[PDB]
Structures are given as C-alpha cells and as structure tokens.
Design a protein around this ligand. Structure first.
Ligand SMILES: Cc1sc2c(c1C)C(c1ccc(Cl)cc1)=N[C@@H](CC(=O)Nc1ccc(O)cc1)c1nnc(C)n1-2
Length: 127
C-alpha cells in the first residue's frame, strides 16, 4: 500500500512568528531529543509500507514526528510554543496508542518524553 503525504512544514496562509520560547524549543528541546540514542525512529514520518504496518494510518490520524517538528521550527511555522509542544505530545501519544506497553518502541518514546518534560519545565517566560 501507500503512505500518506507528510504533515506540512510550510504554509503561507498560516500565521507565524519567532518567539524566545520557540527558540528554546529548537535550541534546547528539539536538539536534546534529536541527539538521544533512541531518537532515530522519531526523526522522520513512520514509513508504514517498509515497516509493514498497514493499519498504522488507520489508527493514527494525526501523524507527527521530530523531522516534521524540526522543519517547522527551522521554518518558523508556529505562532506559539503551545502549538509546538502539542506536536511533541501528539508524537508520543501516537506511539502509545498504536503499540503496547513494554514494547521497545514505547520504552524509547518514554525515554524521550521524560527528557521533553524536564526541558519544557524550564520553558522561559515570554519576552
Ligand atoms: C523506523 C521506525 S518508526 C517505528 C519503528 C521503527 C523501526 C518501530 C521500532 C520498533 C522497535 C525498535 Cl527497537 C525501534 C523502532 N516500531 C514501530 C511499530 C512496529 O514496527 N512494531 C512492530 C514490532 C515488531 C514486529 O514484529 C512487528 C511490529 C513504530 N511505532 N512508532 C514508531 C515511531 N515506530
């Protein structure tokens, strides 16, 4: 079968701006997760064809991954930090929704999410 198109990373119709919080989300949060030993499955959209997961995109109707988030941050796609935080949370949630407790991939997501939470705890005040 086929994969869906990836999430958009550009949209001139969507308002955006740079903020110090979004800068932190790139320089601290994304960078910390991206380098993690368990980042690799999350660095690009799930290829449900090569991974033989034909039900993946029946189950997961809002796909998200850090490759997409990285591009969105580098392109200044977002209006606010909450939009980006939501993309991270959607990514983790998708993994937990599709898979089962204790699966390796869930353990990987949990390791990344722990770090994500530690970093967003110190999101700076907007200025
Ligand atoms: C490139 C990607 S994306 C990505 C993965 C991979 C290999 C990995 C994944 C599984 C284990 C490890 Cl150690 C690393 C990544 N897991 C998939 C889900 C999956 O395929 N599960 C599965 C497992 C065994 C089996 O016989 C049949 C299906 C998944 N579910 N969410 C994501 C993300 N991923």
């Amino acid at each position: 079968g086929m994969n869906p198109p990836p999430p958009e990373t550009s949209n001139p119709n969507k308002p955006k701006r740079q903020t110090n919080q979004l800068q932190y989300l790139l320089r601290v949060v994304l960078k910390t997760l991206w380098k993690h030993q368990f980042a690799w499955p999350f660095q690009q959209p799930v290829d449900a064809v090569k991974l033989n997961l034909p039900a993946y995109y029946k189950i997961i109707k809002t796909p998200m991954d850090m490759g997409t988030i990285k591009k969105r941050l580098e392109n200044n796609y977002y209006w606010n930090a909450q939009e980006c935080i939501q993309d991270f949370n959607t990514m983790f949630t998708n993994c937990y929704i599709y898979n089962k407790p204790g699966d390796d991939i869930v353990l990987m997501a949990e390791a990344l999410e722990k770090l994500f939470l530690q970093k967003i705890n110190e999101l700076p005040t907007e200025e």
